[PDB]
Design a binder for this molecule. Structure first.
Ligand SMILES: [Mg+2]
Ligand SMILES: [Mg+2]
Ligand SMILES: [Mg+2]
Ligand SMILES: [Mg+2]
Ligand SMILES: [Mg+2]
Ligand SMILES: [Mg+2]
Ligand SMILES: [Mg+2]
Ligand SMILES: [Mg+2]
Ligand SMILES: [Mg+2]
Ligand SMILES: [Mg+2]
Lengths: 51, 216, 112, 109
RNA sequence: UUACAGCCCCGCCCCGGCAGCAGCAGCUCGCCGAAUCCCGGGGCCGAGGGAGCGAGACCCGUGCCGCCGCGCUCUCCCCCC
RNA sequence: GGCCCGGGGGCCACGGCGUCCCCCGCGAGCGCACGGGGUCGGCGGCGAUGUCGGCUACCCACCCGACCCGUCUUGAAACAC
RNA sequence: UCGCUGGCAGUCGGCAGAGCGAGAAAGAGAGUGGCGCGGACGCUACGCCGCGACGAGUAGGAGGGCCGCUGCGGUGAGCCU
């Protein structure tokens, strides 16, 4: 029977069923953004201490 | 048989684990964990002995029948859905009942019950609302809190306790639970000036009053 | 020129088009690309196996760009949300027809 | 003891210049006059309350003359606080410029 | 023609030095995202109905099944309520 | 750029023994699920002479639309028959 | 509606063994040596089932009518004071 097409952009496991590397790529992206956010907030703390 | 262990992946976002495949291989330590390789019952009779089968074929077949369904996966019974609460609703907050026979009355919120219904009480001495279940959507949460943290509600009051049975007479355990909770909660609201009058009042809309304009 | 708007798509544009609205011409039918075996059975002879190297061929055209593009069914795009500027005039004169250099990426985002 | 709904006016149907779509009504909620201001009312349910000749059943009461059509606010309409609504039965044309109650209880505060 | 205000250009000062950075001083001026992710809200919709799984001539189960992504046990310790 | 040639904290679809040569084919179990199209193992009220349901069909009201058919004609609502 | 001029005779059942959707031709091949008696529906094949795309029309053409009227041969142990 015909298969319902689900959007890989909004659905995660469909994106993985078509491309398993997207998982690792997204993990790297999320961790990188978290690290950068914490680094920026501590730099802001240092700047306000300098002020 | 070993004792189960908490998952070694802390969830990063739902559906994704924090550690990679081989990283969790190492954490599990699977390098050193490598492994390699009724229908009838006999019953005596007072003759001989009869072998009785507990399953007997139907004595009637319907004229025609429906087929079995294709089976989906994400459909769970209501008893095990995830229950959500609005961030603006916290214990001790003042709510406004909007639908039922107690509509427009200000009440005190206590806890999220098991099935996602808020456990409102209301002081009987104030506005004649008892320990009562309410729906999260059909209430307006005002920004006025009571430090209810140090209040010990009984544990036996649950959804099965509050569910309808089938005139209606009130019961003694209902009355005594009401009395206990009221005796515990009233002195806490007597400490805030004019709050008993606020809870005794009734919410209504007058001319020139637009709900989107006014801050709750 | 008067009947089309065209430009140079991004890699993100290629990804969005191929994943969101990617259909294959299999047995001259319009079959939705829901897994990799549909691509493999029709294009494996060109050592393009998965959605990723289909996208790679299309972006960096490579050798069998003709075969990959012919496998791809033409994309059916919605109306441009927010509205066009002027359908009947060239993009240089503040219309929409003609050759956008790389604003076609904004057009694709807005039309998906 | 007082009112618990917002006042609205059934301005007309969803329409072009020469074509009417009776399945979508236009409400003008009094007080709100801006797109950025009409967000609060999205998803709120609304009632058209009227009176007829013979009695009909009344949930939680005795039969009386009053009847209701139930609907729901769908989304905003233009820059002036007009909203669109869908009623479970298309509104009669005699209700143009008459009061529609917009309730609060489908609330998300 | 700088004084009781300033402004504009030259050369030397580590491109004089320090933040910061297409800036939450929420708008002084751009193009973006394999150099991109997360969360939330509103609206319409539910088309189809025997996809099996497991034992096997030692068996006659069962109704959560396929593909994909994971978790725990068949190793041993420690920590917290 | 060369698996970032080669010598002296973070990440990874890295993971045995056995040897000849090169440079330097069947482990078991369970469990969760963004996984080949909706389910609840969730509820509430109102019902015997006045209430419930009946798109359609009888009459009426309102909003939008709406020129009288056949015909010859390039051209019909035609002051064309 | 058209196309695939697609699928289904495999309902192969205790004389049993449940398969033919899966990237990459072609054997669920045969042999020679070294207890409990059980298992839905289906297939008027002029039938049933599954995918895709498509749907304006005067003059005109073609197909299907389990649309309709009268009479004849068969047939309904048809109907009716
Ligand atoms: Mg818009
Ligand atoms: Mg023209
Ligand atoms: Mg008119
Ligand atoms: Mg004539
Ligand atoms: Mg003439
Ligand atoms: Mg005429
Ligand atoms: Mg005339
Ligand atoms: Mg004349
Ligand atoms: Mg004449
Ligand atoms: Mg036609």
């Amino acid at each position: 029977r015909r298969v319902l097409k689900k959007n890989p952009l909004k659905n995660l496991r469909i994106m993985l069923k078509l491309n398993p590397y997207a998982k690792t790529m997204r993990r790297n992206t999320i961790l990188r953004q978290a690290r950068n956010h914490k680094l920026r907030v501590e730099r802001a703390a240092a700047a306000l201490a300098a002020k | 048989k070993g004792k189960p262990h908490c998952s070694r992946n802390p969830v990063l976002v739902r559906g994704i684990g924090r550690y990679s495949r081989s990283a969790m291989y190492s954490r599990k330590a699977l390098y050193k964990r490598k492994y390699a390789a009724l229908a009838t019952v006999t019953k005596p009779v007072g003759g001989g002995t009869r072998v009785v089968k507990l399953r007997k074929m139907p004595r009637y077949y319907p004229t025609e029948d429906v087929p079995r369904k294709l089976l989906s996966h994400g459909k769970k019974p209501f008893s095990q859905h995830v229950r959500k609460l609005r961030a603006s609703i916290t214990p001790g907050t003042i709510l406004i009942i909007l639908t039922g026979r107690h509509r427009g009355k200000r009440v005190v919120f206590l806890k999220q019950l098991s099935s996602g219904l808020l456990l409102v009480t209301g002081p009987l001495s104030l506005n004649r609302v008892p320990l009562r279940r309410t729906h999260q959507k059909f209430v307006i949460a005002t920004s006025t809190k009571i430090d209810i943290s140090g209040v010990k509600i009984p544990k036996h009051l649950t959804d099965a306790y509050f569910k309808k049975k089938k005139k209606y007479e009130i019961t003694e355990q209902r009355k005594v639970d009401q009395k206990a909770v009221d005796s515990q909660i009233l002195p806490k609201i007597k400490a805030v000036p004019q709050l008993q009058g606020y809870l005794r009042s009734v919410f209504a809309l007058t001319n020139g009053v637009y709900p989107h304009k006014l801050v709750f | 020129e008067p009947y089309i708007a065209w430009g140079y798509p991004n890699l993100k544009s290629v990804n969005e088009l191929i994943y969101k609205r990617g259909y294959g011409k299999i047995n001259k039918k319009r079959i939705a690309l829901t897994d990799n075996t549909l691509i493999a059975r029709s294009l494996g002879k060109y050592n393009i196996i998965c959605m990723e190297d289909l996208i790679h061929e299309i972006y960096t055209v490579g050798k069998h760009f003709k075969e990959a593009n012919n496998f791809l069914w033409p994309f059916k795009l919605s109306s441009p949300r927010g509205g066009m500027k002027k359908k009947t005039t060239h993009f240089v004169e503040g219309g929409d027809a003609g050759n956008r250099e790389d604003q076609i990426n904004r057009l694709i985002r807005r039309m998906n | 003891s007082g009112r618990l709904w917002c006042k609205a006016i059934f301005a007309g149907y969803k329409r072009g210049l020469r074509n009417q779509r009776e399945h979508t009504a236009l409400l003008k909620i009094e007080g709100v006059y801006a797109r950025d201001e009409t967000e609060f009312y999205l998803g709120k349910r609304c009632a058209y309350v009227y009176k007829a000749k013979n009695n009909t059943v009344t949930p939680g009461g005795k039969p009386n003359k009053t009847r209701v059509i139930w609907g729901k606010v769908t989304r905003a309409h233009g820059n002036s606080g007009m909203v669109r609504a869908k009623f479970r039965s298309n509104l009669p044309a005699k209700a143009i410029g008459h009061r529609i109650r917009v309730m609060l209880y489908p609330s998300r505060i």
